[PDB]
């Protein structure tokens, strides 16, 4: 089943930013600190205490993660217990320039942020890393549909798979960030078409629910394997190469005219947008907040595992519309409750994250079926395409809010996610 391997390889494409683009605890690389360490060999914690500016009173880490001290280190370094105290009575009196000579990242491995220096003023480029993938996804969803009839349904599939694998492998060897983003764009252009084509072949050729749920199980197995490889392979180059190698070695007005289809299209577009935003934002919040990233990701994948089974059980008996509202409300409520969790608690945090991700899983399981079943035979493809288009729009928007509102308030992305989740739960009762 090479299609299961394709699904597994798709998982680190849409989600692997968590393990490739992780942000270590960095600070300005100040020359002369090595000389002071040679003069007296303090611990690295003492190095950060005596060199890096302290965190802000309101938990602002910007003053230490992106600023240095102008006090000379080569000279006037007689004091070692507290060199900054001798220079000035108050730490704030000393000049605080920018990271002129780079950064020092406190991880043994390597990351896209560590490699291309996507920190401080460039911290939005890590957002651009995922936004380019999702803009890819969108433009590729248009282009592959346009080009399928040009070269057939098999030559085009083979070409797109080859371009995906080659783009990933060349991504592992990207010299600068511009080539990185270009390969992300190409991979996004081809990869969504690859996944959708694989799903279509695994559904139609067999002659339905079982192969589909096995396909999402393949995706979750790919997520688990991504966690394992990220644990085994720290450097992002190694992880990207070892993820790309498997798959390499093997009308528009017909949905809006009548009020009946217009309202249903609006609801489905909003549901796709909201749940895509919730899923990607929850994953990114995990990446940017949890200090147990590997185990938290493994637990969330292992909770995605029974979410599909729960959805399959519910759709047989409960229905489709009713469990969608419950799952969306569960995700929104989990996001809302995580705001009030104290930083000391971690077990409750991961439990609530698992509940929210299970809710998102079940919600997406009913979204696929309801999207399929709410359109006529001729307009079903157009409806699915436009709904996935809004899904990709939400995917574009998600990084630029998840990683940018945290700079203003770490609980603001969670507030927005809760509002979106409860609004979607209320909305999906109108179908
Ligand atoms: C980031 C996302 O939005 S989800 C992720 C990406 C995606 C977008 C598409 O529309 C095309 C296909 C995919 C790959 C989804 C496939 C189905 C996935 C695996 C979903 C994650 C949750 C779900 C439903 C429940 C389950 O068992 O897995 C996949």
Swiss-Prot record:
Gene name, Swiss-Prot/TrEMBL: SLC22A1
Main location (coarse class): membrane
Protein family according to the UniProt entry: Belongs to the major facilitator (TC 2.A.1) superfamily. Organic cation transporter (TC 2.A.1.19) family.
Task of the protein: Electrogenic voltage-dependent transporter that mediates the transport of a variety of organic cations such as endogenous bioactive amines, cationic drugs and xenobiotics. Functions as a pH- and Na(+)-independent, bidirectional transporter. Cation cellular uptake or release is driven by the electrochemical potential (i.e. membrane potential and concentration gradient) and substrate selectivity. Hydrophobicity is a major requirement for recognition in polyvalent substrates and inhibitors.
Membrane topology field: Multi-pass membrane protein
Protein name as annotated: Solute carrier family 22 member 1
Residues on Cytoplasmic side: 149-154, 316-320, 371-382
Effect recorded for residue 294 to F: Decreased TEA uptake
Domain notes: A large substrate binding region with partially overlapping binding domains for structurally different substrates is formed by several transmembrane helix domains (TMH) including TMH 2, 4, 10 and 11, and it is alternatingly exposed to the extracellular or intracellular side during substrate transport. Amino acids in TMH 1 confer major functional differences between human and mouse orthologs.
Source organism (scientific name): Homo sapiens (Human)
TM spans (from-to): 1-20, 128-148, 155-175, 185-207, 211-231, 238-250, 266-286, 295-315, 321-341, 350-370, 383-403, 411-431
pH dependence statement: Optimum pH is 8.5 for the transport of MPP. While optimum pH is 6.0 for the transport of the drug quinidine, no transport activity is observed at pH 7.5, possibly due to the protonation of quininide at pH6.0.
Induction behaviour: In the liver activated by HNF4A and suppressed by bile acids via NR0B2. Increased by cholesterol treatment in hepatocyte cells.
PTM notes: Phosphorylated.
Effect of residue 66 to R: Affects transporter activity; reduction of MPP(+), serotonin and TEA uptake
Source species taxonomy: Eukaryota, Metazoa, Chordata, Craniata, Vertebrata
Phosphoserine modifications at: 251
Annotated consequence of substituting residue 6 to I: No change in fenoterol uptake. No change in trospium uptake. No change in terbutaline uptake
Pfam families noted in UniProt: Sugar_tr
